[PDB]
DNA sequence: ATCAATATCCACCTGCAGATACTACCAAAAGTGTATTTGGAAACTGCTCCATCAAAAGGCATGTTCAGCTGGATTCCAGCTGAACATGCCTTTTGATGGAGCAGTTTCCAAATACACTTTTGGTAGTATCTGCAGGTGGATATTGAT
DNA sequence: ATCAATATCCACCTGCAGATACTACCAAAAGTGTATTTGGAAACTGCTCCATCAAAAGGCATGTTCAGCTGGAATCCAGCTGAACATGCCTTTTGATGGAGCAGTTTCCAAATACACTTTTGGTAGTATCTGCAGGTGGATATTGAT
């Protein structure tokens, strides 16, 4: 059963579990899911489109973490900006301790 | 008619939602030019996207894409 | 597969997709490792901070599904989240309730 | 004497209702009937997914909706609380899309 | 005896003189103090290659001047010559500067 | 040898005549006296916003100097395109 | 022979190719792209120098400045949407003053 | 020669030939020859980005002058759109049918 | 002030759209190991150009005075737009059936990439000389505003 | 209509900043020519979902009446703001300076891509059960607008 199946990933799921985790007893419906899925794909290609312009402009071939917290720096409105770039340095900070 | 398919009471809906208290008799006619533009410029752009891929369905991707690039991004329909 | 490096970077938002998303998005020849870690952490703090807005909206209208209206009341309320999405519809959430005060009666 | 209210007394009744609600304000198929219309002026035998209408719905209604804010504003600037297609007019034009 | 225009002539004569020429109008040295004073509270020890200056000099008497008409057209539609405050605010906000 | 006196106020540095000068080519005829205090303010927000990101450009090239391209990158991104400076 | 004059442009075909790869718009460029795009550049360099000229020829002048071409953008209704959202240096704006404006 | 300041290359001699053909004897000042440098950038970055989009769009990995040709019709209003489509085909029509 | 007419509200109720849960299945996603490559940091330093200084001088800012005419307040009324009510015509729905055509799949070739070697060129650089026009003058004609 | 103060016009001019012309050099660009790989067009077709009916059911638009109250005209006057003037200072301009820091060139390795290989998981599909809340009811009470 593989035919009529070309894969349609949307981030649902995950956007699912952070759900759970700040509001475990509320649920969320398929429209406003799919307002959600549609908000994280637009802030990554704002994101991404961001830091690949970064690395134009300073003739790099490599869009590495520096480059994704410039770009939200440029981005997201002074305290949203704060946050995410504590989120961020946070996760990169684990990964590499992480076996 | 059609775009006389939008109608008074319509735009006094419309109207209403923006916090509108009293209308003029002309905002009838004005708003259906204005309207008439929008749309105008949207499937202008969607059936160009519809055209590239030649298909004969515009698609609701079409049509976001073409809010995406008029600066309307719209939400819930990219699925 | 031993551990996701979702797990590693300690989040539930797929760090493995966004990577490989990077690539094939012809954003930039190469991608360092951290990137899509930092990126996934991004993603996944500013989808909590909308949900647990339009999770408060739920509440106070007495409700514990979220629906659009939800999202367009947490967003249009919150400064910071009303400047990002300034140029976005957000489809069936509606419009904050708001009159002029100089319509209001006598 | 038969009841009657002020005028503008129901007028901010509605305002209130449509402000409260989100539920689309055009009925769907003549909206249906002129999009195909202005479509076909496009390109010939063309047929929409029936979420392709709902999209442009949901478009033009916010546009209007936010448009009608920005009107109400010039008409309260100059003193009045009716507005006028001067309104418009004036709203479009600062927004760069008559400018 | 002595020879005076009536209020409104030489503001005419002038409109008509600055819409020909094409140089800055705010003074170069204090124009570049001022980049100086709020690039600093944002960053120490910046330093700024001249060009750069100008860049920042035409782009917000570029800014400024198209705001004035918008600023303009918002008197007139209050039927007035005269433009107040509100009229730059209200063109403000319409642009979406605001709210 | 070494100097940088403190900068303070430099706003005022933008001349109620400059102002003038700006509403003329604005094609305005009559301006009311508060004006001047608020075009002031309204240049402060503008060149904030914009210098903000022209440093923000030159910090992450790690660089000392703004540049006319950081600044016409600064310039691009809030839809204030200039043309006339490189790029 | 180059692909400029093989294709009939006065537009450098090649560094355009090679600029559509240094970008990163795309995996792959096709051998027409850059051929199509060095024409449209072409076409619309040529546009907008044919009303530049024409403005600099009704100011006596023979020598394009940036004047000329603010007049030449901002008096033609397409050009004009084309750059709406751009500022050319040193162009100044087109003398308009609004009636009300004027005396009687 | 001071250790080869790395070359920087612009669209100048290309923008002059242009103008001598449109008019043959009118100069060009180097000021305005930096705001056509960045028009034909800007241009070009707008087309090749659209195209670009265009191109994931329809999951394709290849831009070809039919992605070139789409984003001219998208970017490009009426009667600049239809001539500039038009000396496209013509050139990659010619280019093919040669050797 | 009273008191009637409607709207709006809250508590409670029940059907059902849409959300949830389990299970089976499976491509394509992701991790992982290991072989090769290279982007761009480090270090050293050449050479552009930024900050700074000096001095001179006049273009332009500041501050004032004076009164013209504009904005802002008030009054007034004709008429346009809201409210309400009576028709009735069309939008909605919902179900049910062709069939267009989007999307999956397999086949295959024209066209893209990789690569090597050879030629051509646009950018820089150094040095030397034209030229379009800004800005100055002077005198003639046009616009403004007091009578 | 006359007349006088002043701006505006334009022909004329001259310095010089910027534009232009030559040679000379060469690192990078561009073209050429084979070898190797593959994107996506082509054809065929299965199944989703789109256009089109029929068919009440009524919710919603339309037309009309009537008057409240708003927009716009007209009237006045206080003082805000433009014009002109005097005074002089700080920007502008010109030229020189040490030197910070940008940017070139080379060396070199931590981290990227490339490829194979095993294991895992998110998406789809089928079938079953569950439940948050729209939409109805009733009765309280608040709002509005007439006395
Ligand atoms: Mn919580
Ligand atoms: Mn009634
Ligand atoms: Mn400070
Ligand atoms: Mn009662
Ligand atoms: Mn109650
Ligand atoms: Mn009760
Ligand atoms: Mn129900
Ligand atoms: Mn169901
Ligand atoms: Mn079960
Ligand atoms: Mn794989
Ligand atoms: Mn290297
Ligand atoms: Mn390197
Ligand atoms: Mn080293
Ligand atoms: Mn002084
Ligand atoms: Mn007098
Ligand atoms: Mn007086
Ligand atoms: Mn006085
Ligand atoms: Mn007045
Ligand atoms: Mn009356
Ligand atoms: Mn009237
Ligand atoms: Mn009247
Ligand atoms: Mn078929
Ligand atoms: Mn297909
Ligand atoms: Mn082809
Ligand atoms: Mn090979
Ligand atoms: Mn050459
Ligand atoms: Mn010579
Ligand atoms: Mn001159
Ligand atoms: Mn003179
Ligand atoms: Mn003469
Ligand atoms: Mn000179
Ligand atoms: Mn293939
Ligand atoms: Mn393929
Ligand atoms: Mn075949
Ligand atoms: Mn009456
Ligand atoms: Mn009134
Ligand atoms: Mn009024
Ligand atoms: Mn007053
Ligand atoms: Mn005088
Ligand atoms: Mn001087
Ligand atoms: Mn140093
Ligand atoms: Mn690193
Ligand atoms: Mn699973
Ligand atoms: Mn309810
Ligand atoms: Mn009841």
Known sequence: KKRRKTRKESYAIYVYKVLKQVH?????????????????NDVF?????????????????????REIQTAVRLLLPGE?????????????????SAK | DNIQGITKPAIRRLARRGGVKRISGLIYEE????????????????????????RKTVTAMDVVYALKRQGRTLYGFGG | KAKTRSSRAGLQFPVGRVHRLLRKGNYAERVGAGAP????????????????????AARDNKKTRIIPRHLQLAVRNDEELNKLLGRV?????????????????? | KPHRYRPGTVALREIRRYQKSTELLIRKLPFQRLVREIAQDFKTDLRFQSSAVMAL?????????????????????????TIMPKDIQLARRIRGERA
């Open chain 3, 37 to 56: 870690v930092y990126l996934a952490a991004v993603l996944e703090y500013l989808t909590a901070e909308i949900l647990e807005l339009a999770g408060n």
């Open chain 1, 24 to 40: 475990p007893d509320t649920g969320i419906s398929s429209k406003a899911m799919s307002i959600m899925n549609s908000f994280v």
């Open chain 1, 45 to 65: 290609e704002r994101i991404a489109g961001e830091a690949s312009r970064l690395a134009h402009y300073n003739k790099r071939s490599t869009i590495t973490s």
């Open chain 3, 89 to 106: 519809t957000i489809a069936q959430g509606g419009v904050l309730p708001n009159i002029q005060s100089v319509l209001l009666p006598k």
């Open chain 2, 31 to 54: 708003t259906r030019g204005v309207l008439k533009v929008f749309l105008e410029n949207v499937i202008r752009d969607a059936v160009t996207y519809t055209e590239h891929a030649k």
């Open chain 4, 57 to 81: 719905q949901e478009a033009s209604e916010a546009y209007l909706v936010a448009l009608f804010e920005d009107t109400n504003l010039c008409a309260i600037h100059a003193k009045r609380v």
């Open chain 1, 80 to 96: 949203l900006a704060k946050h995410a770039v504590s989120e961020g340095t946070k996760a990169v900070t684990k990964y590499t």
